[PDB]
Amino acid sequence: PPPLQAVLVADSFDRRFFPISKDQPRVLLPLANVALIDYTLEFLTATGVQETFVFCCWKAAQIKEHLLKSKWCRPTSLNVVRIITSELYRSLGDVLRDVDAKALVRSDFLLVYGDVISNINITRALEEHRLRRKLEKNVSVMTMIFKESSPSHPTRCHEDNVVVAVDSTTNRVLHFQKTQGLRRFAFPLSLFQGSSDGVEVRYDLLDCHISICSPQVAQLFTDNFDYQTRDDFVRGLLVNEEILGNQIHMHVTAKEYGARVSNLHMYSAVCADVIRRWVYPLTPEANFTDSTTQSCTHSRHNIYRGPEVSLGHGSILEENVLLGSGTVIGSNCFITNSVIGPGCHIGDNVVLDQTYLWQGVRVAAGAQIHQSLLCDNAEVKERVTLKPRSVLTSQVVVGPNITLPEGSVISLHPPDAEEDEDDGEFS
């Protein structure tokens, strides 16, 4: 068989990150001081992929510049990465149509998005897919990867919850639907006529958004030019079964981790999982993207400390705290369950709970920050309290003596932000 290939869509064709994504692509957002593209590239490289194609449209220049300076673009990298840009891209269907047009792939490639955090090794799934393809003579066209989970887990967001009806003895997907806003699920009877021996209905599957595909997938995408998403392909293929059977199978992992960052809820959940070493060996102290800046040491209670952190006197780091290089922390501080980017400056008697601070964040003394996100070079003045689910975009300052509500999203762009932001808090 030829070397394993992978198509890495480096642009989510949906805007779930305004106004954050208005000056930085979602693919380049730092999760744990490391961009998502680095995580997905490491996942692809570690599983044996030898050739990768990145399709980036929105702000492709920044993605190209970041990739060219990364580890995977070195001559010594075994995962050769090809960068293809186009302003005409509008959906994943367009990307697959372009792949079929230029004939990038030859057999059994990988389809993943550019914001997938995982440590899954797909050797067994790939072998099963290849054996099934050989035995059935080109009937199984896709093998989607799912993770055993529970409906109550923080990673199971309401938006991306999926219920799948499958054939338990061959791992064949018979029905697939999303449960967004549905209090009751329905399944057609045509499932039970064929595989009456065994049918299972599974709601405990977390969609890692990883698929092992065949060039027939791109051929079907270019045949049905209206297809835009993977879900559209799955639904249209499962409903059109009497002709062009082209069945889809699946693989379930239990001891491996995989999930894609789709919104702030998923971002926070995956960041918490990564800090707590749930994606081992992709840990903050592993430095899987070798760089002088992102080196740190691991201590008790999952405390990661970088070089020259210079913690103050009386400040307490409770647990699950990552501190970037060059950060400065004041006295009598209390930081817990938080990720702080490099170069941050923190005042005295602050409280940080489940917050995320990116590069250059400056916080004045006496601040109270809970469950909020602070983007690059954000600033907070004296005695400011940020209620949960607050977002401060880049170059945003908040004036003194103000308590932002529990949904405050402010940026320098007036329309997209719920409140236009400047050196002041009100007006």
């Binding site: 149509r97 230029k102 051929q219 045949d223 030019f225 209206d226 249209g236 409903v239 002709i243 062009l244």
Partner: protein, 410 residues
Amino acid sequence: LTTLDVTKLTPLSHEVISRQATINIGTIGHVAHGKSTVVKAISGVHTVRFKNELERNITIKLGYANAKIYKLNFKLVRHVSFVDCPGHDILMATMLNGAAVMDAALLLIAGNESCPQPQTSEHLAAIEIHILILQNKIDLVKESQAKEQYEQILAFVQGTVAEGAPIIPLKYNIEVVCEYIVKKIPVPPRDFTSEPRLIVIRSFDVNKPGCEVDDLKGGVAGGSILKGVLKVGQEIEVRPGIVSKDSEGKLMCKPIFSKIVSLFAEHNDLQYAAPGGLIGVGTKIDPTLCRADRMVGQVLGAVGALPEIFTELEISYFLLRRLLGVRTEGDKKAAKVQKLSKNEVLMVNIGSLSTGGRVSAVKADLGKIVLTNPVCTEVGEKIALSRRVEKHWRLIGWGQIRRGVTIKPT
């Protein structure tokens, strides 16, 4: 055994020079992909087996079936190619986008039921336009047959608004239908003196795996020729060509030039190709550019056809209010074509050129459709507009091209 030669100047539709296929006759009926048995009983079962691959568009590709009618130790009198695609919507969209397609029709009606399929067939026949209805409800009692004939006559009384005055009634019925077709089918006027033009509907790669470097044949295309006659050895060009966007700019299309090294019908065809059939013009093209159905959607010109490459087209349309002839028991807004929503993918079908297009802008009288791939059809031709409602592309309206974006790369 035929004796086709390479000496002809002004052939005719009924001329015995070709005697393979000159007139294309459609076949739309309520058989629901059951017309294959009738076609085989009228033409032959294994008549078409010359090039096979992995099928791509089963329900969106028009299929032909060559057949020669013999009469009076028998002599062939006429040869007609029967066209029958899965789903009358595709055939209706293709036929009603110009002319020179499906010159005749055969309504495969049923004497058992008068379900909505006959109504849809009648609507498609009216929209597309010399029809010849025929009932295949064999194995029925004499009184039952008379009642079915009375019901069919009652339906044809209403259907005769456009064309509803045919008459037909196991192999005896096939012979009667063949005689009626031979007697009634008229010769259509085809412009043989025009420059040849072929539209590709099927591409193949004849080079088998593990072949030697000597028996390496390639470029075996296919399709249909509308206007003109194709001669072997002529210098042909592909209007679409190879389209690439790797230049970090707009899409660039480079036409592909070749020479007609062969011309094969279902049987062995001569060096000259005539309109009205499925003629595979195998040129000297590399098989890598022409794999299984990888060249479909290109026009094989001869003298550099004036039709330029179009990326986007401004089409004035008249969207049909409801589904043509589809009135189900429920009809819960299913048979209701909505307005042209922005950023919606529609199946633009210019003649036999099936392509895809998304709506970019529209102001109450004309849409600006950006196509998924460049096409070379015309500057003012009639372009149909289709859209699927439930896993089935169906006609939505018409269109007239007024302006477009031209790509002219060397």
